Amino acid sequence: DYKAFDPELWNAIDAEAERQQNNIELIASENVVSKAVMAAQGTLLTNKYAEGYPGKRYYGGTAVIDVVETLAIERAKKLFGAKFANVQPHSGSQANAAVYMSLIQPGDTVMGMDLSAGGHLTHGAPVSFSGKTYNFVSYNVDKESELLDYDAILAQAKEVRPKLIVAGASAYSRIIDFAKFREIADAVGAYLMVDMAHIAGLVASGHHPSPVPYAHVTTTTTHKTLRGPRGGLILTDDEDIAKKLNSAVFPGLQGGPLEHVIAAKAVALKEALDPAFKEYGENVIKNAAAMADVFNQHPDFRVISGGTNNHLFLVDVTKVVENGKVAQNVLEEVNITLNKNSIPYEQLSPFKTSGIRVGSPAITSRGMGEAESRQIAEWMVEALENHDKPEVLERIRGDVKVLTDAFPLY
Amino acid sequence: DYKAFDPELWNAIDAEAERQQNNIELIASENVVSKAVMAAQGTLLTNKYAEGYPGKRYYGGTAVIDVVETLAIERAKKLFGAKFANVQPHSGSQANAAVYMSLIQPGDTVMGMDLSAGGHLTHGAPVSFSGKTYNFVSYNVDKESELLDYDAILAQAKEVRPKLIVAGASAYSRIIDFAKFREIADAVGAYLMVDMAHIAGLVASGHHPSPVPYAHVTTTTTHKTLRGPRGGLILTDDEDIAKKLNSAVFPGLQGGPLEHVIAAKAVALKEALDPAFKEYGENVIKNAAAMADVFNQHPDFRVISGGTNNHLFLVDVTKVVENGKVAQNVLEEVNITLNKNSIPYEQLSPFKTSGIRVGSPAITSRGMGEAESRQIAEWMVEALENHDKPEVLERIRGDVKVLTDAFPLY
Ligand SMILES: Cc1ncc(COP(=O)(O)O)c(CNCC(=O)O)c1O
Ligand SMILES: Cc1ncc(COP(=O)(O)O)c(CNCC(=O)O)c1O
Hints:
Aldolase; transferase
């Protein structure tokens, strides 16, 4: 009945479902969640106000909510090996804000990865509250290797004297050495915060090393590789920091939490505890590597750092099309959606960029394997090399429908 | 059948659905959303990253999200009579942070309603980002009348000279005069921001005059009287302000918006544009006045300000029990949920308080009318008077059950 009351809206919703089905989604930060995760978010837990924490709420009627939120906290702790977790943050951005509010004061100096080399807005962009409220100094990757250089970062930290060093990225493909990051922090008396949003699913699956034992605080989105609902999570092993973080999230930054989304976080966390989640990780890794190999081997394309050891990579497209916006547009013409992306030391406009970013998680969740991944990468190459040949694009689009038909979304 | 995979979680959701069904929910900030609102939040829109705004997004394949977000925006504009809307804020709290970021600077001075008299945490509590970043100086209500004194407030503003005045409350039962707050702001060169979270539904129905033509910026939750999903929303008629508001929400404070929630916002807003929504407004007013009438007349209970012209009211219970907190524990024992609440010039610990806050929107959304409202108040009065007599509560509990069964939740 309700779809009949509001056809403009439900038309659009059904349209997005079909668009997800008919597109090869390579946006590295997307995934395809389980029906269970969506169903948890679609429940009447949305009607409950629950300011406060389990056992100390500011409203009655919260005993069941407590069981739910407590499930979520305990499942995170268990899955990531942390002594404390906070599952209330609305987003990754909010989780990160809460941590800054807990460990440093406005105007304090913070080191963060450079936007262009893979850092997130909340790691010090001047347009973000992060850059506005704190004095962020950025570190980069090496210009020749495109890898983190832990000695250079140490040398810079010794000069800069930060209160906090932030590690983690949106577009770095290689394994990060968290033990080195903590060594660096320790050497200049800084806190270390790790934002593992992109890699949390791989930390869970055993395919990326955990920052949890080395960071004072670890943040993540519950979406992305962890294949959860859209939201945030915070972890730590320090009881005192945990009190500060809890106060920072509420009443410091947020009001009432989204308990329906929290339910959905509990769902996702239990899915990631299942042994099958190790299989998903292994496949995420293989699928991304297979796609990258195609570009490595092709002479007109270069993969940043020469490859990947996680779920994503970047490709410099500028020998074949003008810039990354162009490549993003062309691939979209063949129902392959990704995002243009700055590469390290990017020479072009931020609105244009020299690169594209590709990820495996969504296709891996639809059940695709190495060969499909390889084929996709061939079609991307082919579409960019023939971007001005409508007839080729038309043909690729049809080949892609065969593949999407063959691995249905749900 | 995924519920079989996680029975702890899903049993808990069932428990909460039965708690909500067998409970008279009088927490004034709660409501009961339509199946359609829940369904929209349970969609696969949760899979989609949409940093940016309609037409100017960071990622590809966002043409359908844009239709959905544009519906929410267009509906908020039609419904509230505003020229601009931003529907991305994750919460009421995030919405208010964004306005401050847009209109004033850290350290600037702001007047907002005092917490004891029903201002919100984000209107200046020293444990909120609001009081930590900006110099909040509170106005109160008259000590006698327990009403807002616009003369007193004008004079205080003339001493204080705030950059911004914030009006709106979580616990004031009377009409707020937004024309007066704007003439007050105007007299000192201040912006006026109204946070209408509690009354947005009544504004929507015509039962409370609107702040929108008087406030430079209006904020609200989408949950509460507007009967929508948990979320925030921001309105203005000034274009230059709108641009800032948008930059503040993203990349200023947030990252990716919750487009499934935004779909749900769109749903709720079309519901509120339906002429049936005015009938709901009407009953919300009446049901609250009826529950309030019972306490006025009872000699052991005073109702703050003497009564109400909106969806809520406060009651001093200290005659009959020690404090608000105790009231709340007792009433919960008969399946009546509300919250303890400071009364103006609260004497007692804020962990205790002298009052209860009562609201009609949830019970009105279940179909109850004046007789049931009145009866519910009788039951409350009765349970507080008989608070250590378990055989009585047991009886009230049973009579409550008849009424909850009679007005089933969905
Ligand atoms: C590392 C990192 N941290 C925080 C966030 C922010 O999360 P919210 O959008 O939930 O605020 C992101 C999003 N990154 C977007 C991307 O790479 O596509 C991120 O990659
Ligand atoms: C006036 C007002 N403004 C903002 C908020 C905060 O919204 P979020 O909780 O979505 O951040 C509230 C919550 N008020 C809680 C209550 O009345 O019980 C509020 O009452």
